[PDB]
Design brief:
Chain A: This is Inosine-5'-monophosphate dehydrogenase. Four copies of one chain form a homotetramer. The first copy, chain A, is built from 13 helices and 16 strands. The first copy, chain A, is an alpha/beta fold and 346 residues long. An eight-stranded parallel beta barrel of chain A has the order 5-6-7-8-9-10-11-12, surrounded by seven helices. Chain A has a three-stranded antiparallel sheet with strand order 13-14-15. In chain A, strands 2-16 form a two-stranded antiparallel ribbon. In chain A, strand 11, helix 8 and strand 12 form a beta-alpha-beta unit. In chain A, helix 1 packs parallel to helix 2, helix 5 crosses helix 7 and helix 8 packs across helix 11. Strand 1 of chain A pairs parallel with strand 15 of chain B. The complex binds ligand 8L7 (4 copies) and inosinic acid (4 copies).
Amino acid sequence: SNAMARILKTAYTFDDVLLVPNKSEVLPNEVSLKTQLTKKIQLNIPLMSASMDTVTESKMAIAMAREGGIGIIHKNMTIEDQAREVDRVKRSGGLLCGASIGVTNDMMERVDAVVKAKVDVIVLDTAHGHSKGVIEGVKRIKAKYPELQVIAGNIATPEAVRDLAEAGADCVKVGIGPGSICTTRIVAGVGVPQLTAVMDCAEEGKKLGIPVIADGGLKYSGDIVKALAAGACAAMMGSIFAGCEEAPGAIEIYQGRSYKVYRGMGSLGAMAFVPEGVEGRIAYKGHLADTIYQLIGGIKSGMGYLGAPTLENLYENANFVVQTSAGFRESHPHDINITKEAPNYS
Amino acid sequence: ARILKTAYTFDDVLLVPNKSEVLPNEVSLKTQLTKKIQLNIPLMSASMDTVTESKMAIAMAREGGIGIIHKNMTIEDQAREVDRVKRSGGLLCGASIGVTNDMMERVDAVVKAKVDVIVLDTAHGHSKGVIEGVKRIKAKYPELQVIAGNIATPEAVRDLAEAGADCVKVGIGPGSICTTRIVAGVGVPQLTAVMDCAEEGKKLGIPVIADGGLKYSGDIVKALAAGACAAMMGSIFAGCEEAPGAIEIYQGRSYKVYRGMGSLGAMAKFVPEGVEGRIAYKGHLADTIYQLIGGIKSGMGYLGAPTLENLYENANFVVQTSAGFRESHPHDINITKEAPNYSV
Amino acid sequence: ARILKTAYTFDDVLLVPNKSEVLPNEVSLKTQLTKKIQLNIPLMSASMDTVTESKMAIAMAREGGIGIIHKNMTIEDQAREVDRVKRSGGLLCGASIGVTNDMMERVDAVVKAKVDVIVLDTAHGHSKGVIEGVKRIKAKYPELQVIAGNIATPEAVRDLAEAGADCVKVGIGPGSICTTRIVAGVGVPQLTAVMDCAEEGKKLGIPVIADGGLKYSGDIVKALAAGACAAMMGSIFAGCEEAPGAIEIYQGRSYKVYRGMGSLGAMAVPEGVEGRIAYKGHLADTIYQLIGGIKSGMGYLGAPTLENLYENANFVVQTSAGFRESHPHDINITKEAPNYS
Amino acid sequence: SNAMARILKTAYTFDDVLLVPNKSEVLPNEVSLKTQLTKKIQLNIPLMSASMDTVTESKMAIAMAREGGIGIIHKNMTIEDQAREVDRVKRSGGLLCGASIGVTNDMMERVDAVVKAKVDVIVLDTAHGHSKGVIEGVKRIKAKYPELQVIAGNIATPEAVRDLAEAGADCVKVGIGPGSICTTRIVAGVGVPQLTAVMDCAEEGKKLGIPVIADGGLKYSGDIVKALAAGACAAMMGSIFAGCEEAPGAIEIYQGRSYKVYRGMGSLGAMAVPEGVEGRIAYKGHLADTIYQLIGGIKSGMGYLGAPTLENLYENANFVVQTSAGFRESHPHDINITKEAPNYSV
Ligand SMILES: C=C(C)c1cccc(C(C)(C)NC(=O)Nc2ccc(Cl)c(N[C@H]3O[C@H](CO)[C@@H](O)[C@H]3O)c2)c1
Ligand SMILES: C=C(C)c1cccc(C(C)(C)NC(=O)Nc2ccc(Cl)c(N[C@H]3O[C@H](CO)[C@@H](O)[C@H]3O)c2)c1
Ligand SMILES: C=C(C)c1cccc(C(C)(C)NC(=O)Nc2ccc(Cl)c(N[C@H]3O[C@H](CO)[C@@H](O)[C@H]3O)c2)c1
Ligand SMILES: C=C(C)c1cccc(C(C)(C)NC(=O)Nc2ccc(Cl)c(N[C@H]3O[C@H](CO)[C@@H](O)[C@H]3O)c2)c1
Ligand SMILES: O=c1[nH]cnc2c1ncn2[C@@H]1O[C@H](COP(=O)(O)O)[C@@H](O)[C@H]1O
Ligand SMILES: O=c1[nH]cnc2c1ncn2[C@@H]1O[C@H](COP(=O)(O)O)[C@@H](O)[C@H]1O
Ligand SMILES: O=c1[nH]cnc2c1ncn2[C@@H]1O[C@H](COP(=O)(O)O)[C@@H](O)[C@H]1O
Ligand SMILES: O=c1[nH]cnc2c1ncn2[C@@H]1O[C@H](COP(=O)(O)O)[C@@H](O)[C@H]1O
């Protein structure tokens, strides 16, 4: 007869999908990477460094802003220190600066301090943004500071986009469990594969007039293209920047190789417990400028392939196909002994 | 001969976050193992001669869960193990029973030791022997709580509930030490088996246990969200200090023995349906339970669930590919520090 | 002026045996000192300058209990002492705090050293100084576990709980070296004090410590059965090798110094005396005997655990003739017993 | 000078030699391990823990003394902290205690403080004990504190035993370059293989009535037996003790293995060009379990040599040299070892 079936939707990450080429009348050197992070704030490139104590303090935020993106100063420091870090960025030539805020008893004291330091945007930043504490936190902050730009996260559903927008958020940050250092999905069982999360959240954001950020799980420049084509206004990265000279931490040498420490903000070491992150090391990659150069070149390439002179046109005309694990093997270089370094592929 | 659908295990799915007004410290983990038996936490140790004797059962009960004393010992020895648990403070205790000639003698002895629940536990619970065993036990001991298993279908839930079972145990082939699916070709991926059976149990008012295949705390959250009243583990507890067997050292690492009850070694106490081996020593049970419970409480916070029933009622799963699985785990990082709830 | 009732000490009372299904060896002695601090055995060493420094505190923690480092030293030294215990491998450690001008700066240093619990310890814990002290410490360190004492009434339990104490310590005048009752006229016999204060603490969810007056392992059973979460001892531990002070010999007998912190010596109108007690050797040997006697009593009371012990505790009062029956009598004891005088 | 460079002889380490069994009328349980560390200090067992900041503080010294040996508190701390450390050991039951001293401008100030804390022996301890600084230091200390017992080192020649004895040392410590964490021989080219160094220095020491300590390079209990049979009054170990619970440092876990930090005092990290390295060794649990194995091995060796006492062991010990082929025979060979032995690893 006609049978009863279990309805379970498949959700996709970046490695599950590829963008289909469009007719193109634009060369990659003709495209524009400008984006609205919020209605108020424009970025020259759609890239953000993560608010992590192994990724962004003022050194990284200054370099990020000079490249045309933005850094979010992490909050694993006293209120006074975080205000000093923001102020250091703001004093370095009018550069944009963000600051992370938690759902804490001293939440507004921290907001007041970074506001006095002239922070451009705050990120009310929690493991579970679709929550009463974040919703009320946003309302409180916007009641006191109606023109202060507020990003709220992290979330993974359209319903969360709508609730945080109604609460007064100027932008929402998408990502539950995709981070390279993240164990949320493993230890709590919860998350949404990040390409689907970004797509579904950005679609709701577009209807509401609120942008969304694709936060976490990005490894290659092509991953960022997919996130922007899916509708994200900007991409946030920890792992891709944590090995740069401008990130916190010393350069460590071991058996002829250079490393920097990178760790989840929910790892034991960062929290110092039931942790939701791990602690480790990644390759030292040198100055941020050289990593940004490769990322931008890759984004401009993808836009050339899709005929997009702007990021809005990229989203409007992007079509995806799903690839299998065998397609993934074809997409990567295969059947070759790679003997020389490539600046954008490892 | 027909292909019904794709069936999923825990690693195939993820739970979607819900709007939440409850923090992880505000949630309740209480659960009805049967209508008569409540657990403070939804966790059980397996009835395996390398997992649960009285030492483990006492520890499990003091943590709020329950141990099932295995049956690879004489009847008198199993009765004395149960008795040691019950005298240690009215702690809950279970006991495994097989489909054997002396089945009722063994039931009589653990009933005398005041066991709270027996598990009539077989490779194939959806069988005449188990059905007739449950009916015989309930006829002599109408109020004795009986778990029957193992099973993997809604039909088996119906047939065991009709026989008189107060709870049914799901899992055909998911065990870490299990070769049933390989040697016999039979089984149902465990997440689908639990969703299918727990939905059937809910209609009939009979709880179901998610037994086998659990590796991380998030796997338990998925099993509870799918509707199981409790989760049963061998591998996760077999390395604990309270499990049977000596701590053994090999090249600077501490190990304990862990084996299937259908392995040659356990049956010798011949076509086996299990293997024998070693897993890492984990220290005291309390530290493992703390991580499991913290992960469960975190998952319930993400789903806005103050109770296990609300967790089930509002749980939505999505399927992830193997690319999604690689994103879900830590990736592109050389991990250099131990984490207490994650290993690779 | 009114006489409320007769009040009892440990020697006034005996526990009635219950039907039991537990052997002593199967018993569990874990207890919650506070909501956050669990002990494997319900025993604490007193914060006196002849009982607990880091050496004693480490030994107590290794045995499953805890030691409270006395405050008769500079702030810097007491932080060093706490430091030494905490760096000795994740052992629990407490520290004494007084109602003093430098109270918060002493608290600041011991929390810096990662003390697990503070004891705001005065002669009269039911006082404005202690109540406001507790309030000040809790406002600055909301997570810091705080024991407040000493007290002897349920009203004091209620007031210190409302001030934010996580545990209260009971004992006005029972100490072996104490003269408070003789010089001030004030105190409550300790078994009644513990039972009346624990009853109020149970209703508020706040544990009580039975501090002082314990001589034998059976006394500890009575204090725990009366409702205390833990027993604190000075005299029983002062003769152990791990307590401060040298071993002194006289007439073929070994002794150690033991004195009240309100005695003239310690303060250099006293409420304590100074003297000597027998050397007992290593703490481990004393703890073993205390734990054996406690497990024996719980066996007799059918209590596999300590909360069940309070619930099922029935005392009878004995006379001085009953007391003479309870002790060995009409025997010339010729052999030493490890748990009896 | 008309002298010329020359090659003197072949020199041997412990792995180069074996002790020949003697006629025995003594069982291992009948032998006595007592030894004179100096004319005034007797030890119940001939074992010492090294004065390193990853081996011996008050906890280790207390446990070593409880076992019948002695610990030397390291000097990588303020004078006050080292006096406090000696004080903790002394008040723990009158246990023996040692303390390290360097050739520094504040040498006498440090000596004064540990003397007040009632230290039983100081070790004037430098990379090159056969030097003017150490000789004058010993003389200066012996002038102010004639009764204070003084060990001086490290040395590797009979001439150095003679000169330190003439300066007033009560005991000399032998070892240039044998340490597990030592690179002196690699970076400076200097040292003497430790068995020959101990044998030759102990020969001079017995002629002058001054004991000598065998410091460094010991890995197995049988190595201690060789060092004592060569005439050392005691054996000093860093590596064998650094993994014990009583040594300083946290227990680190990595891939199911427990570790403790161990590093040379001449390494970059401890100095805070190097002559040591920094690393990790296996965690061993409590000192008592390690001592038990070492003492049992020593007693067994004394049984094999019919020695009821350490002086008898030395008087009647005969060595043979083994080749690298004899060494392969001496270790287990041609076996897949499947069970841990408590006194044999790798
Ligand atoms: C990025 C991640 C994963 C991370 C970073 C640093 C730390 C963490 C840790 C490891 C601390 N885990 C969580 O915090 N787990 C969590 C789970 C469920 C829920 Cl519901 C919540 N609630 C959150 O939102 C509430 C306000 O509404 C707050 O109380 C806040 O706790 C948290 C995780
Ligand atoms: C958990 C596993 C896999 C396991 C544990 C220990 C031992 C076993 C062994 C290795 C013995 N294999 C089975 O027993 N294989 C089996 C296969 C098909 C069927 Cl139908 C049955 N029948 C079962 O149910 C009947 C009730 O009537 C019983 O008589 C009983 O025989 C068994 C396996
Ligand atoms: C008897 C013991 C344990 C002892 C220990 C060391 C020393 C002492 C000495 C011998 C010094 N005697 C007292 O101190 N006697 C005393 C009597 C009555 C009162 Cl009311 C108070 N003080 C109270 O007044 C403040 C009111 O806010 C509170 O903070 C609280 O300190 C003290 C005695
Ligand atoms: C145990 C070792 C190897 C060690 C431990 C910690 C640190 C060191 C360091 C790495 C510091 N290296 C030396 O110190 N190298 C050295 C080489 C040749 C000579 Cl001659 C000397 N002179 C020494 O003896 C003189 C007595 O007067 C002193 O002045 C002193 O300088 C030293 C090494
Ligand atoms: O410990 C954590 N657990 C889970 N997610 C984390 C944790 N710390 C940081 N994150 C998230 O992971 C992102 C970085 O991911 P990555 O670019 O893939 O390394 C951050 O921007 C946060 O959204
Ligand atoms: O040898 C056997 N073959 C198949 N399943 C077994 C065998 N022994 C135990 N089991 C099952 O495996 C479960 C433990 O699975 P684990 O938690 O994944 O190690 C037990 O609770 C039993 O249900
Ligand atoms: O001099 C004092 N006067 C009154 N009580 C004191 C004095 N010094 C210490 N105490 C108390 O007496 C207890 C020890 O009593 P013991 O165990 O009977 O020796 C300590 O824990 C304090 O509560
Ligand atoms: O960094 C250093 N370089 C050379 N020798 C050292 C250094 N640090 C300690 N030592 C010596 O090495 C000994 C320990 O060697 P082990 O017992 O073989 O590990 C110590 O007792 C010192 O004599």
